[PDB]
Amino acid sequence: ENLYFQSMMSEQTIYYEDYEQGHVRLTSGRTITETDFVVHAGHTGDFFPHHMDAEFAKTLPGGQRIAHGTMIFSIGVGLTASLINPVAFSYGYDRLRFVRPVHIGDTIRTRVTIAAKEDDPKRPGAGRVVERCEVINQRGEVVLAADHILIVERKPE
Amino acid sequence: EQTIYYEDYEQGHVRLTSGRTITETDFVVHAGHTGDFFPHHMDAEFAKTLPGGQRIAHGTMIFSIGVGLTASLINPVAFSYGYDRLRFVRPVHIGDTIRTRVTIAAKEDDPKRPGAGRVVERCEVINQRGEVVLAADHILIVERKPE
Amino acid sequence: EQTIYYEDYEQGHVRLTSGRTITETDFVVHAGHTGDFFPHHMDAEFAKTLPGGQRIAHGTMIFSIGVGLTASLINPVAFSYGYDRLRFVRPVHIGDTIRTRVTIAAKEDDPKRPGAGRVVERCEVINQRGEVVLAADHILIVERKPEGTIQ
Amino acid sequence: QTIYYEDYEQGHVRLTSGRTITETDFVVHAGHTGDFFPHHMDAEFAKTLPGGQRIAHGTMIFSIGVGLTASLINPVAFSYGYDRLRFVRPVHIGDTIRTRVTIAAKEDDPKRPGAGRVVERCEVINQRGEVVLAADHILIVER
Amino acid sequence: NLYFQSMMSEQTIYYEDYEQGHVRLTSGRTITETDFVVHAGHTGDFFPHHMDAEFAKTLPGGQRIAHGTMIFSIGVGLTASLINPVAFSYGYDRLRFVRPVHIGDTIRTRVTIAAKEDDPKRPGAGRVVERCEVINQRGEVVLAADHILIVERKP
Amino acid sequence: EQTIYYEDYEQGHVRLTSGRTITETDFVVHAGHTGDFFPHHMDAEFAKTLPGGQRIAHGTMIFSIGVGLTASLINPVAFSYGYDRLRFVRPVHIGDTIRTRVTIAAKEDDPKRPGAGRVVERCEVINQRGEVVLAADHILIVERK
């Protein structure tokens, strides 16, 4: 283990064998603000009026501006970035789904569940772990879901 | 706004966006926006330990900006259902420049909706070496032309 | 990148951008970006004592966002020379929504630049009531299509 | 600019103009610092707090509070530190703050005879005139 | 009061006190890559001349150039002052983009009270033109504009 | 989230945060957030004339970021009363990387709160050379178990 992580409270090294199927964690919450809409637009270059024009949004089903899909994804994932596992590599995501729209003033939390574990066909010293991520709003409704695929080092001899 | 119905999507149609250089500011803004300050992205000293020896962009940043580059016109009769097979193919470093290729990759009927079809838009983000750094299949549910 | 040569600009052509609501965020970002935190812009209590009773939008913010709304139309053969008659016309309140109307107001030969022409694009920033809040004449130096050799 | 040590006058008070603390400022402060604690960032959680709404980060009230005094920054004063920084009252979205700076003390230093200690008492006040933050700024000033 | 000073939130300056020929030069501010990225984010303008370093190699100076609205906004911002209750800011004339600004250039703004004129429709006010010139670290003018004020005459 | 009561704090316990490189972006964002654009921080040409020859970070930025690095796990049972002895020890420059060392420095009975105690957490912001650049004593009022 790199000396960096010595004395780091937020570091939890979990090797492939020690991931527990069914383990669940839930993040703290974050209210999605009009600032977040404007920051996301400026960061990504997406200024579509569905996100940025309160007058146009009155004509939409639902009558209000809706958050960019990539914002709910980025923030939902970002909420999980508290504990670092230095032995896990982020390979990608499967089945990213936009389940419900998110509006200004909604508050989100992310639930992360260890879903599946398999051998890595390419690397014998690693395994694959799927973390199911569910972003939930203040009504307890899923607004986004995705399966995060991690390539996790096996524990050393 | 340009209404494009299911039947008008052309399998194999491709567009490539303009380029955007990914800067250290983008790393710092992404961390600030998302809450992800992991040292692989934010600590230049720690990042010397990575195979590239330098900080790597968040996967969600390359996704968000990659997709953002394609946000040039809206189709009011296409619903963004989700993405399949999002892959972080190669790291992106400060100073790399990305462009996004969007391809109409597949079209299928929708089992539940006879009034709509599914269109898969393949999104491939490429760097200044012409290498794919991120790929994902965008799933759209697109209404059929009336009558 | 869509190229339009001088001769293809159509006198009197009008285009209108998509809209964008001017938010309190935009005020705070503009103040932070430009260094202008004076209380007529940034102090809601003091602003109660001003004509109108509300924080006053930075003129440069309405200009920068107003022009920014037009950015999708990229003309690589046009050089931005400057602007004439930048006018601050009406208040813009937090929550107002703006669009920019761009009209080809004038085309003229430029004697200093034989391979180019001058195009004036009148830009009018309009609010949700259709009122002009800011106007400016954008001066473009636009390349002519290559001089042909006429046989 | 400049104010030499002898030019400071104990008891002098300066009151800044105001700045309204916005939701933007909360979100920017979290992004800038990495502090996303739910007291600041989660309006549902914040309903459980005594005020029932989100409260500004102490470091934001400090940074913006001190920033209001910037047009008055003396280039001949080394900023040594602060004593007795206190988070007196919460600041909510939409509150407006001003900073009151009082020259609280001047003392000769046993380490530099060619300089003196100046203490500037800083009080951030809200639109109700209530102190929300206080701190003693220690300056080492050229004699 | 020597012992209690309240910073103003406004400051009245009548026509006669804009003294023609008066010059002021602001402090400097280095224009950074952050400023380019923030400006694009703020305005929605991501044009490759400003945002694509590879594309910019093909341009005459070989590098990204600042948005005109950025140099204007920051240049004016450097000069920002207290609201003047007796002056109306009409807008600007003859805004010119004189030279490109690159990442790492440092700018200051020079404001000269350039011309004063009577107003035929307003005997109790007069027109004041403030010539604003944004200069870079070499002292070259990169942007110029004439700020137009209508200012009440002293009672 | 982790609840730690007064008795649970261990005199002398030490932790170090993750690190963060202080970038030019952080300087620009700090100025934009605080309204302080003074040339020592924001003018690279002027800064050549200063003793170090380069722009120096705002004290309030090193404090805000240095403390922010510690904000990874809420203790709901602790109240943030203030800080003593905030000291600006060394300048921080663009490209310096900081992390924060947090030490439980002192524990004592709260004079007026029977059901709480007082904990001092010394925060030392440390650069890439391991040098302390900023120190502050975070004063916590912590509920008894």
The span from the CA of D117 to the CA of F62, in Å, is 23
The letter for the amino acid at F28 is V
- The answer to whether A131 touches A113, Cβ cutoff 8 Å, is yes
Strands F78-88 and B14-16, by their bridges, are: unpaired
Question: What phi, psi does B86 have (nearest 5°)?
Answer: -70, 125
On whether any CB of chain A is under 8 Å from the CB of E40, the answer is yes
Interface test with C, best of D69, D93, D96, D98 (most C CBs within 10 A): D96
The span from the CA of A69 to the CA of A102, in Å, is 9
Look at chain F and report how many structural domains it folds into: 1
- Identify the DSSP state of E83: B
- Identify the DSSP state of D70: G
- The answer to whether A26 touches A110, Cβ cutoff 8 Å, is yes
- The answer to whether D80 touches D115, Cβ cutoff 8 Å, is no
On whether any CB of chain C is under 8 Å from the CB of D17, the answer is yes
The span from the CA of F140 to the CA of F81, in Å, is 6
Distance, C-alpha E40 to centroid of its chain: 19
The span from the CA of E112 to the CA of E136, in Å, is 17
- The answer to whether D69 touches F59, Cβ cutoff 8 Å, is no
Tell me the HSE value of E133 on the side-chain side, using a 13 A CA sphere: 14
The span from the CA of E49 to the CA of E67, in Å, is 9
Give the resolution in Å: 1.8
Task: Work out the number of other CB atoms within 10 angstroms of the CB of residue A68.
Answer: 25
The span from the CA of C23 to the CA of F34, in Å, is 20
Residue D13 CA: distances (Å) to CA of A79, D4, D96, D103, E7: 44, 17, 20, 7, 11
Residue F15 CA: distances (Å) to CA of D47, D57, F68, F90, F134: 32, 22, 14, 21, 16
Return the structure tokens found at C25. 């965020």
The letter for the amino acid at A70 is T
The span from the CA of A139 to the CA of C105, in Å, is 53
Residue B56 CA: distances (Å) to CA of B44, B93, C12: 10, 5, 49
Question: What are the start-end ranges of the H helices in D53-110?
Answer: 58-67
**Rg of the Cα atoms in chain A:** 18
- Identify the DSSP state of E25: E
The span from the CA of D70 to the CA of D59, in Å, is 16
- Can you tell me whether residue E123 is helix, strand or coil? coil
Residues of chain F with C-beta less than 8 angstroms from the C-beta of D75: 40
Q: Measured between CA atoms, how close is E80 to chain C, in angstroms?
A: 6
Of A47, A49, A55, Cβ closest to residue C128: A55
Q: Which helix (H) or strand (E) holds C44?
A: helix C44-47
- Residue identified by tokens 């501006």 is A65
Q: Which residues pair with B125 in a beta bridge?
A: B100, B134
Distance, C-alpha F77 to centroid of its chain: 20
Q: Measured between CA atoms, how close is B69 to chain A, in angstroms?
A: 6
**Sequential DSSP letters for C116-149:** EEEEEEEEEEE-TTS-EEEEEEEEEEEEPP----
- Can you tell me whether residue E89 is helix, strand or coil? strand
Domain that holds residue A56: 1-157
- Identify the DSSP state of E27: P
CB pair distance less than 8 Å for F88 and D80? yes
The span from the CA of C20 to the CA of C70, in Å, is 12
The letter for the amino acid at D27 is V
Q: Which residues of D27-41 are buried (b: 16+ CB within 10 A; e: fewer)?
A: bbbbbbbbbbbbbbb
**Rg of the Cα atoms in chain D:** 17
- The answer to whether B71 touches A44, Cβ cutoff 8 Å, is yes
- Identify the DSSP state of D111: S
Return the structure tokens found at E2. 């020597």
Query: What separation, in Å, do the N-terminal and C-terminal C-alpha atoms of chain B show?
Result: 21
Closest CA to F32 of B107, A72, B28: B28
On whether any CB of chain F is under 8 Å from the CB of D123, the answer is no
Is the sign of the CA dihedral D143, E5, E11, E17 positive or negative?
negative
Return the structure tokens found at A72. 């709910």
- The answer to whether F115 touches F144, Cβ cutoff 8 Å, is yes
- Can you tell me whether residue F66 is helix, strand or coil? helix
Task: Please give the interface size between D and E, counted as residue pairs whose CB atoms are below 8 Å apart.
Answer: 24
Q: Which residues pair with B20 in a beta bridge?
A: B98
- Identify the DSSP state of A125: T
- The answer to whether E97 touches E70, Cβ cutoff 8 Å, is no
Task: Please give the interface size between A and F, counted as residue pairs whose CB atoms are below 8 Å apart.
Answer: 22
The span from the CA of A122 to the CA of D64, in Å, is 53
CB pair distance less than 8 Å for B43 and F97? yes
CB pair distance less than 8 Å for B83 and A90? no
Q: Measured between CA atoms, how close is D73 to chain E, in angstroms?
A: 14
- The answer to whether C102 touches C31, Cβ cutoff 8 Å, is no
Closest CA to E71 of E44, E41, E98, E111: E98
On whether any CB of chain A is under 8 Å from the CB of E148, the answer is no
The span from the CA of E7 to the CA of C43, in Å, is 14
Farthest-apart Cα atoms in chain A, separation = 63
Task: Work out the number of other CB atoms within 10 angstroms of the CB of residue E3.
Answer: 12
The span from the CA of A66 to the CA of A58, in Å, is 11
Q: Measured between CA atoms, how close is C43 to chain D, in angstroms?
A: 5
- Can you tell me whether residue E99 is helix, strand or coil? coil
Return the structure tokens found at F70. 């510690």
Nearest CA in chain B to A4: B46
Return the structure tokens found at C10. 């159509």
Work out the angle between the directed axes of helices D58-67 and D23-33 (0-180°, nearest 10): 110
CA dihedral in degrees (D55, D57, D62, D64; nearest 10)? Answer: -80
Return the structure tokens found at E39. 């400006």
- Can you tell me whether residue D25 is helix, strand or coil? helix
- CA angle, C54 as apex, C50 and C55 as ends, to 5°? 95
The letter for the amino acid at C110 is D
- The answer to whether C40 touches C47, Cβ cutoff 8 Å, is yes
Strands D13-15 and E4-6, by their bridges, are: parallel
Interface test with D, best of E5, E8, E11, E34 (most D CBs within 10 A): E5
Burial of F130 (C-beta count, 10 Å sphere; 0-12/13-18/19+): exposed
On whether any CB of chain C is under 8 Å from the CB of E35, the answer is yes
- Can you tell me whether residue B81 is helix, strand or coil? strand
On whether any CB of chain F is under 8 Å from the CB of D26, the answer is no
- Can you tell me whether residue E17 is helix, strand or coil? helix
Return the structure tokens found at D99. 């900073």
Strands C116-126 and C78-88, by their bridges, are: unpaired
The span from the CA of F98 to the CA of F95, in Å, is 10
The span from the CA of B37 to the CA of F97, in Å, is 13
CB pair distance less than 8 Å for E3 and D15? no
CB neighbour list of residue D48: distance below 8 Å, 6 or more residues apart: none
Closest CA to D39 of D23, D63, D20, D57: D57
- Can you tell me whether residue D107 is helix, strand or coil? strand
CATH assignment of the domain containing C107:
3.10.129.10
The span from the CA of D15 to the CA of C123, in Å, is 42
- The answer to whether D94 touches D18, Cβ cutoff 8 Å, is no
The letter for the amino acid at E83 is I
Task: Work out the number of other CB atoms within 10 angstroms of the CB of residue B118.
Answer: 17
- Identify the DSSP state of B48: G
Q: Measured between CA atoms, how close is F24 to chain E, in angstroms?
A: 8
Strands E141-152 and F14-16, by their bridges, are: unpaired
Q: Measured between CA atoms, how close is E73 to chain C, in angstroms?
A: 5
Is the sign of the CA dihedral B127, F94, D22, F125 positive or negative?
positive
The span from the CA of B29 to the CA of E39, in Å, is 13
**Rg of the Cα atoms in chain C:** 19
Residues of chain E with C-beta less than 8 angstroms from the C-beta of C65: 42-44
Distance, C-alpha B24 to centroid of its chain: 20
- Residue identified by tokens 């929504």 is C97
User: Using a CB cutoff of 8 Å and minimum separation of 24, what contacts does A11-14 make?
Assistant: A11/A83, A11/A84, A11/A85, A11/A86, A11/F18, A12/A83, A12/A84, A12/A85, A13/A85, A13/A86, A13/A87, A14/A85, A14/A87, A14/A88, A14/A152
Closest CA to E97 of C78, C122, C114: C78
Closest CA to B94 of A15, F25, F76, E12: F25
Task: Work out the number of other CB atoms within 10 angstroms of the CB of residue D70.
Answer: 16
Question: What phi, psi does C25 have (nearest 5°)?
Answer: -55, -45
- Identify the DSSP state of A80: T
The span from the CA of C145 to the CA of E109, in Å, is 38
Q: Measured between CA atoms, how close is A8 to chain D, in angstroms?
A: 16
CB pair distance less than 8 Å for C44 and D17? no
Residues of chain B with C-beta less than 8 angstroms from the C-beta of F128: 45
Q: Measured between CA atoms, how close is C44 to chain D, in angstroms?
A: 6
Touching subunits of C (3+ CB pairs, under 8 Å) are A, B, D, E, F
On whether any CB of chain B is under 8 Å from the CB of D86, the answer is no
Is the sign of the CA dihedral C77, C78, C80, C82 positive or negative?
positive
Return the structure tokens found at D74. 């003396």
On whether any CB of chain B is under 8 Å from the CB of D32, the answer is yes
On whether any CB of chain C is under 8 Å from the CB of D20, the answer is yes
Q: Which helix (H) or strand (E) holds F135?
A: strand F132-143
Q: Which residues pair with E118 in a beta bridge?
A: E126
Is the sign of the CA dihedral E39, E44, E46, E47 positive or negative?
negative
Return the structure tokens found at B70. 């394609």
The span from the CA of A143 to the CA of A110, in Å, is 10
Of E27, E34, E106, Cβ closest to residue F24: E34
Residue C127 CA: distances (Å) to CA of C72, C103, E102, F100: 20, 17, 34, 49
Interface test with D, best of C38, C43, C50 (most D CBs within 10 A): C43
CA dihedral in degrees (C18, C22, C28, C31; nearest 10)? Answer: 80
Question: What phi, psi does F139 have (nearest 5°)?
Answer: -95, 120
Return the structure tokens found at B91. 């790291």
Q: Which residues pair with F103 in a beta bridge?
A: F14, F122
